Every structure is written in structure tokens, then in C-alpha cells.
């Protein structure tokens, strides 16, 4: 199937309380597989998925050194960006980084990503050509000129086309069914009387992977878009996801309603009812 790998960095300054906190997480598709936290007792890259545990000591060592160095680089970046924006040296600010690769079924690169936000706002991004930058403002143009002179885009491109693709292919080989085979939802409908004249029908999807899903209530096979309460997809805590959709219906009309479930793990879309 098509797959992605992503790394997410968060640096948060705390002037007067020491160096910024740096946190990294890595994902393949919707599965988190590594973390690093600069405030940990002995900071190191740590496994968060079973299939990464087989990587040897040289892997964990190289990555730990990278995160430690990137934390110091982000600390310098935060100093520079409060300077660019003429901000107080007393306040806490956030630098987020998000990068990785999207591959097709053959494992070839479809798209590379390398982009940044300062205090929750897009700041600079590597363009789809992996050769040029888009800067949000004159501050971000200082960064852009620095990175153009340092040939940063070529460094990002070499990673995105090389290590990103090759290591994602490896993780997919080692993760096998956990990463390649979607886990369909376990589904049920519940019924909750509100009054003598109204009841809630709730359609549940539990234990599914990946997170992408569609739940819709139909009355006589027509979508009830404007009348469905839909909760945001949420993690179960065991790497799988949950969602539900509810409709309030007249008592005795429940038979007219069906819940439609679309998920990659299902052989075909499900039609459920209160039963």
C-alpha cells in the first residue's frame, strides 16, 4: 500500500529555567514508533512500537546523538527568532518541526516534507520540488537566505529521497501485518430512550487502524448529515482508534435508520442497524 514516515519536533523555551525542552516523536502512518525527551533522566531515543525493538545499538546511538544536537540547534533558532520578531527575552516561545516522506506501493518517493511553525504559525517550508523554500514573512526570509547559502535544501532532499525512503521500506518489512494490513472496526448500535417520543441511536466503531474512517446515519438510505452528532476520531490507547455517530429519532421509527461504515480494513462497507 501507500505509506508515510513523519518526525515531529517540539522545542519550548523557558527563559530563566534553563535550556528549551526538546521532544521528538516518529510515526509510520498512524503508528508512533520512537520518542526522545531532552528532560528525561538520561535522554535517549526510545522504542514505542514492538517492530522497532530489533534495531541494533548503532541505530539507537546515532539517533540519540542527532536529537541532542538538534535540541541545541533549536535553542539557537529560538534565540534568533525572538531577535527577528523583536520579542521579550523573558517569554516562552514554541518552535515545531515536521518532516518525512510519502511513498507509493513500489516504495518510491511520491512527496517530501520539511516544514516549521513558530508560536503555532507556519514559518518556513521546503517546496514540493525539494529545492526551494516558501517563507511566511521577512523574518522567515532571513532564515531562507541563511539556508540558501548553507545549501540546506540539498541536505533535506538527500534525506527525503534516500534515508527516509530506505528506512520506511525497512520498517514496513519488519512491521509486516501491523503496518500493511488494516484492522477493521468492531461495530455495534446502541439505543438510548430520551423520552416517550425520542431515542438516540449511536453507531460505534472500535479497535480500528488506521484512523481514517467514515460513519454516516441514513434514513431510508439517505444521509442524515445535518442531524448526526459525530465525535472526533480518538485513540483507544492500544494503537487503535474509536469513533461514534448518533442520531435522535422518533420512538418506533428506529427501523428506518441504518449506520454506514467505510474503513480500509472492511472487505466491503458495512450497513448496521439496531439489533
Amino acid at each position: 500500500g501507500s505509506h508515510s514516515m513523519r518526525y515531529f519536533y517540539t522545542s519550548v523555551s523557558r527563559p530563566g529555567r534553563g535550556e528549551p525542552r526538546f521532544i521528538s516523536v516518529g510515526y509510520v502512518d498512524d503508528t508512533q514508533f520512537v520518542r526522545f525527551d531532552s528532560d528525561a533522566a538520561s535522554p535517549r531515543e526510545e522504542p514505542r512500537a514492538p517492530w522497532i525493538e530489533q534495531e541494533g545499538p548503532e541505530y539507537w546511538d546515532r539517533n540519540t546523538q542527532i536529537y541532542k544536537a538538534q535540541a541545541q540547534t533549536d535553542r539557537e533558532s529560538l534565540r534568533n527568532l525572538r531577535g527577528y520578531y523583536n520579542q521579550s527575552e523573558a517569554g516562552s516561545h514554541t518552535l515545531q518541526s515536521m518532516y518525512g516522506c510519502d511513498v507509493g506501493p513500489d516504495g518510491r518517493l511520491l512527496r517530501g516534507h520539511d516544514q516549521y511553525a513558530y508560536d503555532g504559525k507556519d514559518y518556513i517550508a521546503l517546496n514540493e520540488d525539494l529545492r526551494s523554500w516558501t517563507a511566511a514573512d521577512t523574518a522567515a526570509q532571513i532564515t531562507q537566505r541563511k539556508w540558501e547559502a548553507a545549501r540546506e535544501a540539498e541536505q533535506r532532499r538527500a534525506y527525503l529521497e534516500g534515508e527516509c525512503v530506505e528506512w520506511l521500506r525497512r520498517y514496513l518489512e519488519n512491521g509486516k501485518d501491523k503496518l500493511e494490513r488494516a484492522d477493521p472496526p468492531k461495530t455495534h448500535v446502541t439505543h438510548h430512550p430520551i423520552s416517550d417520543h425520542e431515542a438516540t441511536l449511536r453507531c460505534w466503531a472500535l479497535g480500528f487502524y488506521p484512523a481514517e474512517i467514515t460513519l454516516t446515519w441514513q434514513r431510508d438510505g439517505e444521509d442524515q448529515t445535518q442531524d448526526t452528532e459525530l465525535v472526533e476520531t480518538r485513540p483507544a490507547g492500544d494503537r487503535t482508534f474509536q469513533k461514534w455517530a448518533a442520531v435522535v429519532v422518533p420512538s418506533g421509527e428506529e427501523q428506518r435508520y441504518t449506520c454506514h461504515v467505510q474503513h480500509e480494513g472492511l472487505p466491503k462497507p458495512l450497513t448496521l442497524r439496531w439489533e
Binding site: 518526525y7 521528538s24 516518529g26 541505530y59 546515532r62 539517533n63 542527532i66 536529537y67 544536537a69 538538534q70 540547534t73 539557537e76 533558532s77 534568533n80 527568532l81 518552535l95 518541526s97 518532516y99 516549521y116 514559518y123 518556513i124 532564515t143 541563511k146 539556508w147 548553507a150 540546506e152 541536505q155 533535506r156 534525506y159 534515508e163 527516509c164 528506512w167
Partner: peptide
Amino acid sequence: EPRXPSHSM
């Protein structure tokens, strides 16, 4: 595996 560190901004 992660990318090697960037130049600072």
C-alpha cells in the same frame, strides 16, 4: 531514522 541536524534558523 531521523535526519541529521539542520543549520539554525
